[PDB]
Scaffold this active site. Structure first.
Site, short mmCIF file in Angstrom:
data_model
loop_
_atom_site.label_atom_id
_atom_site.label_comp_id
_atom_site.label_asym_id
_atom_site.label_seq_id
_atom_site.Cartn_x
_atom_site.Cartn_y
_atom_site.Cartn_z
N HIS A 1 1.02 -1.03 0.04
CA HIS A 1 -0.03 0.03 -0.07
C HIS A 1 0.78 1.30 -0.05
CE1 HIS A 1 0.78 1.27 4.15
NE2 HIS A 1 0.78 0.09 4.55
N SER B 1 4.18 2.78 8.28
CA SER B 1 4.33 1.14 7.83
C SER B 1 5.41 0.74 7.17
CB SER B 1 2.98 1.03 6.69
OG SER B 1 2.90 -0.08 6.09
N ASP C 1 -0.95 -7.77 1.09
CA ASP C 1 -0.52 -6.33 1.06
C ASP C 1 0.97 -6.40 1.13
OD1 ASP C 1 -3.20 -5.16 1.28
OD2 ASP C 1 -3.02 -5.45 3.45
#
Lengths: 151, 52, 48, 151, 52
Positions: free
Chosen positions: A29, A103, A51
């Site tokens: 992402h 992230s 992901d």
């Protein structure tokens, strides 16, 4: 420690990539290019299911990849910005500890081994659920708290 | 001409489905650090053994 | 007419297997649904 | 003991609703609408054989849920009205320790985890056997002592 | 008209019985914390998992 690389957009930092074992893992992402040219030129296999974008590490010149484990006992883990509490099937952090752009950071156990990689989280009130990539002895799996958003 | 086109199209689709199935089946192993692909699976997926 | 009346339906034309097929198809769905409920009730009964 | 999850569902209170794990729980035999709005609007699934109604806990108040376990070693357990003696697989309290209207209260282990919820009990001399909702691995079960009354 | 009514009624009953079975064998999973419904049961009863 120090196995974290920045993933940058043209005008901003969007996330991080981590060297774990024989493979380099980046959140799917996150859009941007890895700061290290050696990894930036590396082809990655994208999977929207977990992901993840993963690629083999050039271990002949990258021997600093971290150690990892599939074990997930109850207790506290080190996720850079503080401790994260693990109970049941979920990781939990303080509400003000999480943020966008973070992230790709790994969660370490007390042996310095990587257990999971942070994708995002969900605000559960007094605490924030942490959305992570984890693995079992055979394959990679993902943990997705209800209402979780990508960071 | 039409029958040839349709038969060739069907084959192209069957191959595309096989490639899609192969990627989905193997991804969890190639996406996972420290993982090793089972011998039988590598034969089925028509891929190189383990990580080499 | 030299013959008698048709009478109460029961003596209808053959090739009426459509009636049996539809009746059987519906009866089968009921029989299966009934079995599913019976099995669940049996399991639910044993559990406390 | 040191935590309150016991939300009243009526002006005249007859038992309490509580947060256990990821589910909102209350006795099916007690009438009223759960307070605090967020729980009031929840739809509940009822099972007449368990005397239990449950609904999903809203994400934003999920962090306030009580910890849960199915494990039940023999020994003593805690609750808001005293101690509970667990013997022979059954929960027992001193007579007078609990009364009608005190139902819906969780029974906690030494780690603060919920093992059972009180529905009622049977008064046998100096001791009262409790009618409770409890759990085994991946299943909900109920214990109902003979002569037990609803609370 | 009557045969159609009766056959439709029988189907409606079969559906009602299936729905009763669907609730009775699943409710205990919803009541239990974690909603740990097994994969095969989720396909059979057309229900969603704990993390859905």
């Amino acid at each position: 420690n120090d196995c974290i690389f920045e993933v940058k957009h043209e005008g901003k930092v969007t996330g991080y990539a981590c060297l774990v074992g024989d493979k380099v893992m980046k959140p799917a992402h996150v859009k941007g290019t890895i700061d290290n040219a050696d990894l930036a030129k590396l082809a990655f296999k994208r999977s929207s299911k977990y992901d993840l974008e993963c690629a083999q590490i050039p271990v002949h010149m990258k021997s600093d990849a971290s150690k990892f484990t599939h074990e997930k006992p109850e207790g506290y883990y080190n996720w850079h910005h503080g401790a994260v509490q693990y109970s049941g099937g979920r990781f939990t952090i303080p509400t003000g500890a999480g943020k966008p752009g973070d992230s790709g950071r790994p969660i370490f156990d007390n042996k310095g081994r990587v257990v999971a990689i942070v994708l995002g989280g969900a605000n559960e009130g007094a605490r924030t659920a942490l959305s992570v990539v984890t693995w079992n002895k055979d394959i990679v799996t993902k943990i997705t708290p209800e209402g979780a958003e990508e960071w | 001409s039409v029958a040839s086109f349709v038969l060739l199209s069907m084959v192209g689709v069957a191959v595309g489905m096989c490639m899609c199935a192969r990627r989905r089946c193997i991804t969890p192993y190639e996406l996972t650090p420290g993982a090793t692909v089972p011998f039988l699976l590598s034969l089925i997926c028509c891929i190189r053994t383990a990580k080499a | 007419a030299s013959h008698t009346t048709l009478g109460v339906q029961d003596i209808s034309a053959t090739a009426m297997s459509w009636v049996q097929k539809i009746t059987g198809g519906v009866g089968l769905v009921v029989a299966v649904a009934a079995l599913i409920l019976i099995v669940v009730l049996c399991v639910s009964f044993s559990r406390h």
